[PDB]
Enzyme design. Structure first.
Site, PDB file in Angstrom:
ATOM      1  N   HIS B 201       0.817  -1.208   0.000  1.00 39.34           N
ATOM      2  CA  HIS B 201       0.000   0.000   0.000  1.00 39.34           C
ATOM      3  C   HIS B 201       0.851   1.259   0.000  1.00 39.34           C
ATOM      4  O   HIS B 201       0.423   2.291  -0.527  1.00 39.34           O
ATOM      5  CB  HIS B 201      -0.946  -0.006   1.198  1.00 39.34           C
ATOM      6  N   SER B 205      -0.271  -0.868  -6.180  1.00 41.18           N
ATOM      7  CA  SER B 205      -0.438  -2.142  -6.864  1.00 41.18           C
ATOM      8  C   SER B 205      -0.230  -1.982  -8.367  1.00 41.18           C
ATOM      9  O   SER B 205      -0.196  -0.874  -8.906  1.00 41.18           O
ATOM     10  CB  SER B 205      -1.814  -2.741  -6.567  1.00 41.18           C
ATOM     11  N   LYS B 227     -16.114  -7.877  -6.357  1.00 39.71           N
ATOM     12  CA  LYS B 227     -15.326  -8.817  -7.150  1.00 39.71           C
ATOM     13  C   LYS B 227     -14.635  -9.852  -6.265  1.00 39.71           C
ATOM     14  O   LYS B 227     -14.592 -11.043  -6.604  1.00 39.71           O
ATOM     15  CB  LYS B 227     -14.304  -8.059  -7.992  1.00 39.71           C
ATOM     16  N   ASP B 228     -14.131  -9.430  -5.102  1.00 42.17           N
ATOM     17  CA  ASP B 228     -13.535 -10.387  -4.182  1.00 42.17           C
ATOM     18  C   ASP B 228     -14.581 -11.239  -3.473  1.00 42.17           C
ATOM     19  O   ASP B 228     -14.280 -12.376  -3.121  1.00 42.17           O
ATOM     20  CB  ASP B 228     -12.646  -9.672  -3.167  1.00 42.17           C
ATOM     21  N   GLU B 271       3.227 -34.473   0.374  1.00 41.09           N
ATOM     22  CA  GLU B 271       2.028 -34.046  -0.329  1.00 41.09           C
ATOM     23  C   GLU B 271       2.377 -33.289  -1.606  1.00 41.09           C
ATOM     24  O   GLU B 271       3.531 -32.932  -1.860  1.00 41.09           O
ATOM     25  CB  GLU B 271       1.139 -33.205   0.588  1.00 41.09           C
TER      26      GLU B 271
HETATM   27  C1  HEM Z   1       1.024 -16.373   2.166  1.00 38.44           C
HETATM   28  C2  HEM Z   1      -0.055 -15.904   1.550  1.00 38.44           C
HETATM   29  C3  HEM Z   1      -0.124 -14.579   0.899  1.00 38.44           C
HETATM   30  C4  HEM Z   1      -1.066 -13.640   1.153  1.00 38.44           C
HETATM   31  C5  HEM Z   1      -2.190 -13.748   2.147  1.00 38.44           C
HETATM   32  C6  HEM Z   1      -0.799 -12.534   0.319  1.00 38.44           C
HETATM   33  C7  HEM Z   1      -1.622 -11.410   0.357  1.00 38.44           C
HETATM   34  C8  HEM Z   1      -1.591 -10.486  -0.658  1.00 38.44           C
HETATM   35  C9  HEM Z   1      -2.557  -9.500  -0.908  1.00 38.44           C
HETATM   36  C10 HEM Z   1      -3.824  -9.282  -0.123  1.00 38.44           C
HETATM   37  C11 HEM Z   1      -2.145  -8.792  -1.987  1.00 38.44           C
HETATM   38  C12 HEM Z   1      -2.889  -7.634  -2.599  1.00 38.44           C
HETATM   39  C13 HEM Z   1      -3.940  -8.119  -3.605  1.00 38.44           C
HETATM   40  C14 HEM Z   1      -3.304  -8.494  -4.916  1.00 38.44           C
HETATM   41  O1  HEM Z   1      -2.947  -7.632  -5.681  1.00 38.44           O
HETATM   42  O2  HEM Z   1      -3.140  -9.784  -5.239  1.00 38.44           O
HETATM   43  C15 HEM Z   1      -0.912  -9.328  -2.418  1.00 38.44           C
HETATM   44  C16 HEM Z   1      -0.185  -8.843  -3.487  1.00 38.44           C
HETATM   45  C17 HEM Z   1       1.116  -9.257  -3.761  1.00 38.44           C
HETATM   46  N1  HEM Z   1       1.781 -10.274  -3.211  1.00 38.44           N
HETATM   47 FE1  HEM Z   1       1.052 -11.483  -1.790  1.00 38.44          FE
HETATM   48  N2  HEM Z   1       0.281 -12.768  -0.440  1.00 38.44           N
HETATM   49  C18 HEM Z   1       0.745 -13.997  -0.155  1.00 38.44           C
HETATM   50  C19 HEM Z   1       1.837 -14.662  -0.707  1.00 38.44           C
HETATM   51  C20 HEM Z   1       2.744 -14.003  -1.508  1.00 38.44           C
HETATM   52  C21 HEM Z   1       3.950 -14.533  -1.947  1.00 38.44           C
HETATM   53  C22 HEM Z   1       4.445 -15.908  -1.600  1.00 38.44           C
HETATM   54  C23 HEM Z   1       4.561 -13.571  -2.731  1.00 38.44           C
HETATM   55  C24 HEM Z   1       5.870 -13.675  -3.396  1.00 38.44           C
HETATM   56  C25 HEM Z   1       6.038 -14.440  -4.465  1.00 38.44           C
HETATM   57  C26 HEM Z   1       3.693 -12.445  -2.775  1.00 38.44           C
HETATM   58  C27 HEM Z   1       3.979 -11.287  -3.461  1.00 38.44           C
HETATM   59  C28 HEM Z   1       2.989 -10.356  -3.758  1.00 38.44           C
HETATM   60  C29 HEM Z   1       3.146  -9.293  -4.747  1.00 38.44           C
HETATM   61  C30 HEM Z   1       4.365  -9.028  -5.588  1.00 38.44           C
HETATM   62  C31 HEM Z   1       1.983  -8.615  -4.755  1.00 38.44           C
HETATM   63  C32 HEM Z   1       1.656  -7.421  -5.605  1.00 38.44           C
HETATM   64  C33 HEM Z   1       1.045  -7.855  -6.929  1.00 38.44           C
HETATM   65  C34 HEM Z   1       0.223  -6.713  -7.450  1.00 38.44           C
HETATM   66  O3  HEM Z   1      -0.606  -6.060  -6.627  1.00 38.44           O
HETATM   67  O4  HEM Z   1       0.311  -6.385  -8.605  1.00 38.44           O
HETATM   68  N3  HEM Z   1       2.584 -12.747  -2.020  1.00 38.44           N
HETATM   69  N4  HEM Z   1      -0.594 -10.370  -1.578  1.00 38.44           N
END
Ligand code: HEM
Ligand SMILES: CCCCCCCCCCCCCCCCCC(=O)OC[C@H](COP(=O)([O-])OCC(O)COP(=O)([O-])OC[C@@H](COC(=O)CCCCCCCCCCCCCCCCC)OC(=O)CCCCCCCCCCCCCCCCC)OC(=O)CCCCCCCCCCCCCCCCC
Ligand SMILES: CCCCCCCCCCCCCCCCCC(=O)OC[C@H](COP(=O)(O)OCCN)OC(=O)CCCCCCCCCCCCCCCCC
Ligand SMILES: CCCCCCCCCCCCCCCCCC(=O)OC[C@H](COP(=O)(O)OCCN)OC(=O)CCCCCCCCCCCCCCCCC
Ligand SMILES: CCCCCCCCCCCCCCCCCC(=O)OC[C@H](COP(=O)(O)OCCN)OC(=O)CCCCCCCCCCCCCCCCC
Ligand code: HEC
Ligand code: HEM
Ligand code: HEM
Lengths: 240, 380, 101, 52, 49, 68, 60, 72, 54, 54
Positions: B201, B205, B227-228, B271
């Site tokens: 934030h 994004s 949407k979510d 798994e």
């Molecule tokens: C463990 C569970 C995870 C949760 C709960 C989580 C949660 C979130 C949420 C709520 C967002 C914002 C919504 C979205 O744009 O998709 C987000 C974005 C993002 N997450 Fe995660 N995430 C997780 C795992 C990961 C992992 C493993 C990575 C690294 C590979 C990661 C990297 C990112 C990135 C780079 C964004 C920004 C993408 C964008 O908004 O364009 N996340 N994540």
């Protein structure tokens, strides 16, 4: 042998997505377990109170529990007595420990058939093919005494004597007690014993499918109605 | 009077995060997935809490307590199979979320990416210990295999593994401490996810085009909220048809037997979300080298920000690197298939080629393709 | 020769941003050098770039493209950010070689 | 892409920062030896030869 | 000039009750609001169940 | 037995197909080449598995229709 | 004489409190009717297999 | 931080109320050609990796079932 | 209770609840500190401490 | 271990066989007591110096 034989898929009455178990078959397989399979195999996770509302009434299951005797105690003097069974009692073990189980069955330990459908690949198809697949060994392999040739067992030399045959027991409802019918009934009963929640799970799944087939176009219509402001938005660019 | 949404010291955070957050208008359905992950996380916690209300961490009464949950607790089978299948669906959303981050160039947010890699390590450890927890045959033997390959480390591996074990083998000390760690780790994951959202934030994004999205931005409410909700309901559809119609298509049948140290299973595998890692491990004929390759596989996923040699952020306008990306995804599918196979012909050579191509596509061929399209578009 | 130009035109059509009305120089991921290049732009080119990016985002939201007559052709794709970007990279390299000595 | 860091000024900066980094490595080595009770080191220090 | 702007035709998107530009609105607004809020109410009933 | 097993009837009906009988002469050549005192480790497990797979697939196609 | 969604909106959906009241009333009516229909369908799929279909030969 | 994210000059946007317009305006008739258009754009980049690894999966299964045969 | 009295179900659910409560306590303590830091803290004299702050 | 047959026995196993498990358990109990001491004095200070206006 390194190569193994896979059990075929049988058309079970509960094989459908919304199809339930046949409770008469579960009852028949319960007495198949009782007069045949209970001499060697234990059922440590199933009680007599799990049969009420499924195959028996409370009076019939209470009579079944009071038929068999259960060790209970100790008393005020400090000794273990031999009481009649109750509805809350688990099914009686044939042996107190696995060492006497191996001693009585020549080294091989007969396993607990509580999740023997879920512990094996193929499920109740494996049990049906094992009980109705006892055949003579082929030439080129010699079988020592105390082992039997079942091709569905891994290694093809099982230590279980062939337990079921034609008219091995008598059915209460007058069903002809053929070997395949007995095997089908005990496979249905073992499927119930592994998954006692199966009928309730499939009813809940039917309710879930109907509710989500209701909910999905409605929330899709709500999402599309709120997003139609952006989906129909038009843009214009007029520099001077 | 005043605006209570923007001036209250607690409601200001929710207003800045989920109500009046500026979001790109053109983000696709893949942008739902991470939010679904958060929902799935709390779902796991809720189910886990009720699975903590009837489970006893003791080798005499672990399997019996699990069967007591399945048979005697009212709808305990439902909550247990929701916990297991929601763990599988949590990893499904994890792989799709990480694949979105890899494809659309979201790894340029370096602190958010590395924090996410830390979250990935934590959830993999949580799922491993949770799979050890019901104390079946495959739980005990998978814990034995993972701790033995941890013991392959020279001169500190033996001490570390007998200190992780609490003994000379896997016993009730290991089971109790795995219960404690599996309990406590998702709250660390939740706090780390709060930090993850904080960094996102404060950096904003990303859109699927990779361009600057500040020209067309919309509030999070009421577009991406609904949407979510639609994505949450689809995720509930798949989770409920997995828990209510096929409870054991992803589970292991050998986990339904009590744990026996005397009897080893004919095939030992973890798994399905560990299977590509196991196949990468099994290819290299060196146990220290295999553990090194596993940790550096997840670390070159973490190192992917430093391999960006292209002037375009997303892969929307980069078709050669798109082709290489889908080769990488299919190679991950191949490694997942090989990881569930024994070490027989022809799986060794296929697994070795798969791991070699995986490391070559991640490390070598993708910056080469980026330079090739940079030259090919007259960018340099 | 001309074969390389035709094959570049085929790749330009295969890239797909020209179907959104974009140009090549709009597709640059903005680093600090690109940000200074945009900051040095004249106002009319800046407004055209902002409208083109906004229209591309509006089309990508609807999962649609422009009609084939409105696609950005390979001939009139004017490279407007290249001289500003070249001077920005040259000044940054001058600062770099001063700081390295 | 670290060819920016090749020059006389960066070489002089690194040469100035060698002894501080070496002293910090000495502190880290002594801290890892003390907190782990390594038998390869404390058996050579003359005073600490009582616990082994 | 600022009088040169005209809203483009939305007849490919408008409802069946608001297509006719020569008839007044507010005789069909309650029906469209009732349809949308009925969809929302049925969704809320299912979610509550 | 006075009670006739339906499984035996379905099995002997399923010996009348073509894949089962081809596996039957394959098993026949196997067991008279290993029953001729060839003094080998080779047995007839594979031919028995092929014949039993064909026969049991045929049986499982039509076993449960006559059972109660 | 307007359409039934028009009077439905003007009497039920115009105020938020009676909107929630009719959501609750329709929720309890819907849960009763939907449980009736779902047990009817699940009963219709499975003749002769459930316990309630066979609890007369043994209950006595 | 609305109001200071960017600077846009001379852009006019027209939008409708959600209650004056259809939710699904020509849903199938203009949804099917757009779906096949996106399909035609993306299958030549997406599908042949999956075709190739399906071939590898089938060949590996065939070699595994052949490698456990008796002869020789 | 999970039954007629305190028994094994009560002990298991009390272990789960005793485990889960301190993390909620920690989150509420963060909210506690946030609500304090919105308005500043209090001095023993009860006056305005804005004239002398460190 | 949170079972009624193995709760007191597990506590004695902590205090008798685990290395410095007595220190951990009695530290936990006396830390709970000192936690309530700090909590009571924190509440009483909030009451005395008029800190309830927040
Ligand atoms: C463990 C569970 C995870 C949760 C709960 C989580 C949660 C979130 C949420 C709520 C967002 C914002 C919504 C979205 O744009 O998709 C987000 C974005 C993002 N997450 Fe995660 N995430 C997780 C795992 C990961 C992992 C493993 C990575 C690294 C590979 C990661 C990297 C990112 C990135 C780079 C964004 C920004 C993408 C964008 O908004 O364009 N996340 N994540
Ligand atoms: C060929 C078959 C028919 C195709 C067809 O009719 O296409 C029409 C139409 C064609 O799309 P279009 O022409 O681009 O115009 C629609 C707009 O794009 C706007 O529509 P959209 O495509 O943006 O839809 C929003 C999107 C939003 O996506 C989500 O909310 C999903 C988020 C991810 C969920 C992941 C769950 C976990 C998955 C694990 C694996 O919804 C979906 O992806 C599916 C929603 C299904 C709702 C329930 C239908 C019954 O297709 C759709 O709208 C898609 C849904 C079709 C049903
Ligand atoms: C998968 C099924 C096929 C999905 C598909 O059709 O993808 C095509 C889509 C193209 O999207 P794009 O080119 O950006 O847009 C075209 C016009 N809008 O491309 C996409 O949507 C790509 C975004 C999703 C990428 C992830 C898919 C694979 C999931 C597993 C990734 C694992 C990554 C490594 C994790 C462990 C390390
Ligand atoms: C022509 C259509 C005929 C049928 C008509 C029906 C309509 C179908 C769709 C028509 C589409 C028309 C064109 C519009 C789409 C955009 C252009 C396109 O996709 O072209 C095809 C593409 C060309 O390549 P492109 O990415 O454009 O540029 C590369 C630079 N020359 O080409 C490709 O992307 C080809 C990719 C081939 C990849 C082969 C990979 C082989 C090796 C795989 C190994 C993977 C597993 C490894 C495992 C190791 C361990 C065992
Ligand atoms: C014990 C110490 C008592 C003591 O020293 O009291 C006198 C002291 C005077 O402090 P003060 O009045 O602020 O003036 C300082 C000089 N002008 O006053 C103080 O130090 C005030 C101490 C306030 C906090 C006392 C808390 C006592 C414990 C209360 C527990 C129960 C709380 C309520 C629970 C329901
Ligand atoms: C004593 C003669 C037994 C009777 C009565 C039954 N079974 Fe049995 N079975 C017995 C032994 C000693 C074993 C041990 C394994 C071995 O080497 O033989 C078994 C095993 C089974 C199994 C498990 C097969 C596997 O692959 O693990 C099953 C599913 C099984 N037995 C089924 C079964 C049924 C349904 C019975 C009632 C008709 C039954 N058995 C009776 C010995 C004896
Ligand atoms: C703090 C929250 C959590 C608690 C209290 C918790 C608790 C438990 C308990 C008690 C079990 C054993 C019950 C059983 O499986 O029979 C279990 C199993 C498991 N948990 Fe969790 N868990 C939590 C979060 C998670 C998370 C976040 C994941 C990963 C997505 C996860 C993955 C698993 C898995 C894979 C199993 C094994 C299921 C099986 O038996 O097949 N848990 N958990
Ligand atoms: C869970 C135990 C508690 C913790 C961890 C906690 C934590 C804190 C902290 C860190 C501060 C700021 C430092 C300070 O001013 O001393 C604080 C201040 C304060 N707390 Fe608590 N607190 C707790 C319990 C309570 C309770 C029960 C009350 C209500 C009676 C309370 C009311 C206050 C008030 C009024 C202040 C501010 C007063 C001032 O700063 O002058 N706290 N607390």
């Amino acid at each position: 042998s390194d190569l193994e034989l896979h059990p075929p898929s049988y058309p079970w009455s509960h094989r459908g997505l919304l199809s339930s178990l046949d409770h008469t078959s579960i009852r028949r397989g319960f007495q198949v377990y009782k007069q045949v399979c209970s001499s060697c195999h234990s059922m440590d996770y199933v009680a007599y109170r799990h049969l009420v509302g499924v195959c028996y009434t409370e009076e019939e299951a209470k009579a079944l529990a009071e038929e068999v005797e259960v060790q209970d105690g100790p008393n005020d003097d400090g000794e273990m007595f031999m009481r009649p069974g109750k509805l809350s009692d688990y099914f009686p073990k044939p042996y107190p420990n696995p060492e006497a189980a191996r001693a009585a069955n020549n080294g091989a330990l007969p396993p607990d058939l509580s999740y023997i459908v879920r512990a094996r690949h193929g499920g109740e198809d494996y049990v049906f093919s094992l009980l109705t697949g006892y055949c003579e060994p082929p030439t080129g392999v010699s079988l020592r005494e105390g082992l039997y040739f079942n091709p569905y067992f891994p290694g093809q030399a099982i230590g279980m004597a062939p337990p079921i045959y034609t008219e091995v027991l008598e059915y209460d409802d007058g069903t002809p007690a053929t070997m395949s019918q007995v095997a089908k009934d005990v496979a249905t009963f073992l499927r119930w014993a592994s998954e006692p929640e199966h009928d309730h799970r499939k009813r809940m799944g039917l309710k879930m499918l109907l509710m989500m087939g209701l909910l999905l176009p409605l929330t899709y219509a709500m999402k599309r109605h709120k997003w139609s402001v952006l989906k129909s938005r038009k843009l214009a660019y007029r520099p001077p | 009077m005043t605006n209570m949404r923007k001036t209250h010291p607690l409601f200001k955070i929710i207003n800045h995060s989920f109500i009046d957050l500026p979001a790109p208008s053109n983000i696709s359905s893949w942008w739902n997935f991470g939010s679904l992950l958060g929902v799935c996380l709390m779902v796991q916690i809720i189910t886990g809490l009720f699975l903590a209300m009837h489970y006893t961490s003791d080798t005499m009464t672990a399997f019996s307590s699990v069967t007591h949950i399945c048979r005697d607790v009212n709808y305990g089978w439902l909550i247990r199979y929701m916990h297991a299948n929601g763990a599988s669906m949590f990893f499904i959303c994890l792989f799709l979320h990480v694949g979105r981050g890899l494809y659309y160039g979201s790894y340029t947010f370096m602190e958010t990416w590395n924090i996410g890699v830390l979250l990935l390590f934590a959830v993999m450890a949580t799922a491993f210990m949770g799979y050890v927890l019901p104390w079946g045959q495959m739980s005990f033997w998978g814990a034995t295999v993972i701790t033995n390959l941890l013991s392959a480390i020279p001169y500190i591996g033996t001490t570390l593994v007998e200190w992780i074990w609490g003994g000379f083998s896997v016993d009730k000390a290991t089971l109790t401490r795995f219960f404690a760690f599996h309990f406590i780790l998702p709250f660390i994951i939740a706090a780390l996810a709060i930090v993850h959202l904080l960094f996102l934030h404060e950096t904003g994004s990303n859109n699927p085009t990779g361009l600057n999205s500040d020209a067309d931005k919309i509030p999070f409410h009421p577009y991406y909220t609904i949407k979510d909700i639609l994505g949450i309901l689809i995720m509930f559809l798949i989770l409920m048809t997995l828990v209510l119609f096929f409870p054991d298509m992803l589970g292991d049948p050998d986990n339904y037997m009590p744990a026996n140290p005397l009897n080893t299973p004919p095939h030992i595998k973890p798994e399905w979300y560990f299977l590509f890692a196991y196949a990468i491990l099994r290819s290299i004929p060196n146990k220290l080298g295999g553990v090194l390759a596993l940790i550096l596989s997840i670390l070159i996923l973490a190192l992917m920000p430093f391999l960006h040699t292209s002037k375009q952020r997303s892969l929307m306008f980069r078709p050669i690197t798109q082709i290489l990306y889908w080769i990488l995804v299919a190679n991950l599918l191949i490694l997942t298939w090989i990881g569930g196979q024994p070490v027989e012909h022809p799986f060794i050579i296929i697994g070795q080629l798969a791991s070699i191509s995986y490391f070559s596509i991640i490390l070598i061929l993708m910056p080469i393709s980026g330079i090739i399209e940079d030259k090919m578009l007259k960018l340099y | 020769s001309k074969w390389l130009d035709g094959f570049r035109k085929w790749y330009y059509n295969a890239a797909g941003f020209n179907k959104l009305g974009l140009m090549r120089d709009d597709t640059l991921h903005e680093t600090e050098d690109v940000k200074e290049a945009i900051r040095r732009l004249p106002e009319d080119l800046y407004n055209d770039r902002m409208f083109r990016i906004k229209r591309a985002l509006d089309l990508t939201m609807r999962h649609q493209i422009l009609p084939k007559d409105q696609w950005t052709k390979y001939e009139e794709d004017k490279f407007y950010l290249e001289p500003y970007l070249k001077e920005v990279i040259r000044e940054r390299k001058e600062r770099e070689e001063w700081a390295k000595k | 892409m670290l060819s920016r860091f090749l020059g006389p000024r960066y070489r002089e900066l690194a040469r100035n920062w060698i002894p501080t980094a070496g002293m910090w490595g000495t502190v880290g080595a002594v801290g890892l030896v003390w907190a782990t009770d390594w038998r390869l080191i404390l058996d050579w220090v003359p005073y600490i030869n009582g616990k082994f | 000039s600022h009088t040169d702007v005209k809203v483009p035709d939305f007849s490919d998107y408008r409802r069946a009750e608001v297509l006719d530009s020569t008839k007044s609105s507010k005789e069909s607004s309650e029906a469209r609001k009732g349809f949308s809020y009925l969809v929302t109410a049925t969704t809320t009933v299912g979610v509550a169940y | 037995e006075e009670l006739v097993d339906p499984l035996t009837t379905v099995r002997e009906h399923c010996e009348q197909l073509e894949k089962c009988v081809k596996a039957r002469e394959r098993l026949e050549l196997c067991d008279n080449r290993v029953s001729s005192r060839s003094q080998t480790e080779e047995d007839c497990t594979e031919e028995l598995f092929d014949f039993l797979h064909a026969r049991d697939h045929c049986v499982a196609h039509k076993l449960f229709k006559n059972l109660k | 004489s307007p359409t039934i969604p028009s009077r439905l909106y003007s009497l039920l959906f115009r105020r938020t409190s009676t909107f929630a009241l009719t959501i609750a009333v329709g929720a309890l009516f819907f849960e009763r009717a939907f449980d009736q229909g779902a047990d009817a369908i699940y009963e219709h799929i499975n003749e002769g297999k459930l316990w309630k279909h066979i609890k007369h030969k043994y209950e006595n | 931080e609305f109001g200071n994210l960017a600077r846009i000059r001379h852009v006019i946007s027209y939008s409708l109320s959600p209650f004056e317009q259809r939710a699904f305006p020509s849903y199938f008739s203009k949804g099917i050609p757009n779906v096949l258009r996106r399909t035609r754009e993306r299958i030549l980049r997406v599908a042949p990796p999956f075709v190739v690894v399906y071939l590898i999966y089938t060949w590996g299964n065939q070699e595994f079932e052949q490698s456990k045969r008796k002869n020789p």
